[PDB]
Amino acid sequence: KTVLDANLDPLKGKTIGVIGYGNQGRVQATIMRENGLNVIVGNVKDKYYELAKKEGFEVYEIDEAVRRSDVALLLIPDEVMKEVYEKKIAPVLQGKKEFVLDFASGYNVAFGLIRPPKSVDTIMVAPRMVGEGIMDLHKQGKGYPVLLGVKQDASGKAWDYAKAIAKGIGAIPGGIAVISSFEEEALLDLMSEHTWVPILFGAIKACYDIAVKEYGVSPEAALLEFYASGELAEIARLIAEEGIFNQMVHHSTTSQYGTLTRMFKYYDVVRRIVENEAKYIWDGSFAKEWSLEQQAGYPVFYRLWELATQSEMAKAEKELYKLLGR
Amino acid sequence: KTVLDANLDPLKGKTIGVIGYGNQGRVQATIMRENGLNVIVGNVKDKYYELAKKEGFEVYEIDEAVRRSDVALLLIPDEVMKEVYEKKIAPVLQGKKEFVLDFASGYNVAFGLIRPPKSVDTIMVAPRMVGEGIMDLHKQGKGYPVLLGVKQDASGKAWDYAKAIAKGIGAIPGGIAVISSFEEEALLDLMSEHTWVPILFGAIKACYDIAVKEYGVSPEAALLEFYASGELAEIARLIAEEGIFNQMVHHSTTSQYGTLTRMFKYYDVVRRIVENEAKYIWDGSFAKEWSLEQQAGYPVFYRLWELATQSEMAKAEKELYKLLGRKV
Amino acid sequence: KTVLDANLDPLKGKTIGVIGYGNQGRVQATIMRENGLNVIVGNVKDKYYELAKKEGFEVYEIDEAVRRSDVALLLIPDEVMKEVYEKKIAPVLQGKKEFVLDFASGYNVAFGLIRPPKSVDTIMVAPRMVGEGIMDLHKQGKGYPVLLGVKQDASGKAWDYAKAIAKGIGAIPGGIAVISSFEEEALLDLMSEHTWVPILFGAIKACYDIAVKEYGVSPEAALLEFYASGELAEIARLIAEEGIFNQMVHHSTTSQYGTLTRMFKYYDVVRRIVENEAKYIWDGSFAKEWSLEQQAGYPVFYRLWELATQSEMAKAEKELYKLLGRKVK
Amino acid sequence: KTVLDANLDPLKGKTIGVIGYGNQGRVQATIMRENGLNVIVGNVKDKYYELAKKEGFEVYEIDEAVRRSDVALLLIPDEVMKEVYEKKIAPVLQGKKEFVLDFASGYNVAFGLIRPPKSVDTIMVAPRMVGEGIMDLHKQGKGYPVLLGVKQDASGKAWDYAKAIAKGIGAIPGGIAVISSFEEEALLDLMSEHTWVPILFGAIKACYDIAVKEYGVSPEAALLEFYASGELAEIARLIAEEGIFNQMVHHSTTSQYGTLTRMFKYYDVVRRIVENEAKYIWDGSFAKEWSLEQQAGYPVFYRLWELATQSEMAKAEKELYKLLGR
Ligand SMILES: [Mg+2]
């Protein structure tokens, strides 16, 4: 099912704590205030505390913000969220008889890394839009798409709170709110980061490496074909506006034929990759792998960053981007 | 060897601290007191502290219980034992000149996760019986089987302490005490949890999934065949009383023939699984895997629990157990 | 569907012949009489004839019992049923214009080894409960589960007769009667005997053989871990009472994690075995294999019995069971 | 262990029924009588009844012979023994409180095809010698080898009866009596018939087929190499007299080197065959296969006889043996 509008009433006369004043936090706080909700901000004292104060919000330490709140949006990065939840939020939530904890990312709840108490409505309103894009579309009077989820319905009104927040943050009406789940949103997010993105970058690197090492192509010619021209961004725009296949009518018949035949040829290969990565997300295996990479001090993350940025392709890219003035 | 009785004398006039008043702790404490030994209990103030107080035991914080004790039985879950040992026990043991630390589980000592100091007798008395079963058999005047082990003989009497505790907790006489080790007991415990148990549950799930998806069998018929009837529990009783093969005489010849032929047919397949899991326990690989699952916050444990309890079979089981009026 | 109760009326004023006074026969006869049905017994003159006479039943030769009956329950072992049906029952059934022949086992009808005539309602009421368990639950006023099936609806009332017998034998109400079939019941029974049971015993034997031969474990330690303690029976009870996964909450987290990870790890391997054994049942292949083992004089059955009972594990089990004071062969 | 002599006393003052007056029966009966034992014969009224009568034995129907006997040797072919045991022996044995039933072949008892009652000593005295060979060696005052077994010790003296019969039939002293079993004797007999014998004949046929079809060798040359000369019988004699390897000293060094290297080269291949055939005997699988071949009316036996006797090698053998006058 889909949701095109909602009643804002379950959030009326409630103190709403936006924890974290980053990309998502600033935008979700600002727009909820513009729709006349009582919004405070929780944040450590960074630049982000200052900016929230400067944009007229009551700003507190995270534990205080949660103490004062009936509803909190935990909009901090996933990789620090567990520490902050356990030290500054969970102790306060032992006190509350009723509470609504919202997330924009399913990861930590989906894999059981954060388990709010039985009394807490655990809900998700997860945009598919960067944050600069959300401000832009709100200024134009338009909405954006979100995924909704409820892990734990303590109150019996968790879905109403989720729909309410979706209206509050300016997603609906004008955009859509899709009925989803914490597990589903985490799966979808990670499937992209672990399949089509890395397959795309690998394929582009292999194009460069084969063109240059085996066919005697200049680094600059190879870079200009494989990504360094505008090409990739104007195809990506037509995919979003017209459709992934519909968009192909603007290319030569030679191009259409080559892409269609090779897409069907290699579907089974990329399908096996997608199946294996999806299974490994859904099991919890990826959450264990990444948690243990963090606890080990990021040595694989560190070395793969070095090897990617010191690749023949990355070095040639640096020289070409210098030569073109970027 | 095996041991059928022992001298209780090495425990006489000694304070015996049972750390943890769970399944094993309650029973080992109760029976040691009934055999006239000076038993205190170490435990945080949970429900378990309340029950121990109500059953007439002096109860202390774990560090106090150890300070007051000449002998302690560390009968808490293996998954919290390292933290509790390091924070509440090891500091106290730096003080002691003589001490006996007993375990009912070899795991933490076998994989070096708990290394008591050189002055401490590190011993094991590990039952093969649930705890409800131990109380039942003590009330009937009968013993039960235990595995004995000694990692570290500081005193030169560690084996006497082990045999003594075996008598103390009512294992012997009447039952047996088998000469074993921390490594052997940990290996045996984990071999079951990693081979025949998961193979059994998997085989039962595959029977359900194939019957229902491929042969059009009703969920209810499939559940009633594969486990939801009494069948499994009365075969398990006859295996323990008469023997695993001897027990088969009570089934049809058709059933005997089918089971015998298919057991020999698939032995090599399940043997490969057993070999691989045993090797991976014995190396320490499983201890690293499980320790790292805990430190990562149990995400695989969490998700596999969800996937097992949300399986077609588990959902159908819930509906059928409701319909038959069993707890859900 | 499922059935929780039924009208007993289609069996009222009818003579019901229980053929065979073994585990299932004695119980189904006794309980049908206690519910006020006209029950006679057919049996050869064994100890079982004597016991039926002593428990107050009219007892006859099998052919006589069938001649006198409107309804018969053929509750004899599957491996002798074909001979007895062909010699003592089929000739009598050529005579009858109406008849209800009930089985507690689908095997012989499912694989076409017994094909009653077109005029006979061929029906199945198949318990999932041993027989000592059925008497126990009837004494407590409770029912038990059965599978119902109809191969041949001659009368147009075969399903009513099946539900009726289910009530008659004290399955319902209190228990359930599941709508099933001869083929389905035979498949389900044999799938267990050919997959999870032999896989379990093999896995337990391999645990013993590896622990003892490769890790230097004492026979007695290995036997106490793998089955010779109470362990298996109290897990089997909690599986039936709480559920197969729900039951795991009573074990250590270490135990839960080990079992869950390894169950998912090895599912595909045991699934292949289940697929292969199910296909071989459903084809009739197993019925041919077993029929030919019987006709050959049971030489594989005989030798596999010897090899199982003379295994290192079976010999050690005998010594340990002696030492603990349990029944020893 | 081994047994070189035994006390004949457990058979003294007992009626000994030899059932079957074939190769083994005639010889075991004759020699037991010559050692002063009370020997009667059971047999159907064939030529063999006549011969037993003519050689001075009391001869009866099989059931009568068993009724009159304290000890019987069931020395009839294995492939008829089950029928004869069930119809003419088992009914009589229901009556006996004590009895000793001896076999010269383990097959039927080993695979449970004949199961004498709990009260019967079920024993085996199994020669390794044809029967013409046993008469020959008794006339020379020498013994021969037997395997002893006991399936069922009802009396507690079954082993003494087995050793006694071994002395009775003139095996010991002079020869040996090896402690064995029904299963072991059946296994040993069938291992030969299912491994080295058929491997030998197959290898000889393959030598013929390859020489003739691929190397243009005349059928007569190929037959003269591979078996039709004396070669095979004089090697077989020296193997039995001197030893399987010791015997090789009489051949060229070229021959020794070729045989030693190729024996070690192919050991693993023939070992796999031996393992597979032994396992299939020991399980009871072969007993089921053969019983079902008989019940199906011998169609594989019949067709394989045709294909062996109608092979290019068998036809050429017939022409050559005609030409040499055999
Ligand atoms: Mg994404």
Ligand SMILES: [Mg+2]
């Ligand atoms: Mg265990």
Ligand SMILES: [Mg+2]
């Ligand atoms: Mg059965």
Ligand SMILES: [Mg+2]
């Ligand atoms: Mg069953």
Ligand SMILES: [Mg+2]
């Ligand atoms: Mg355990």
Ligand SMILES: [Mg+2]
């Ligand atoms: Mg031979």
Ligand SMILES: [Mg+2]
């Ligand atoms: Mg030569």
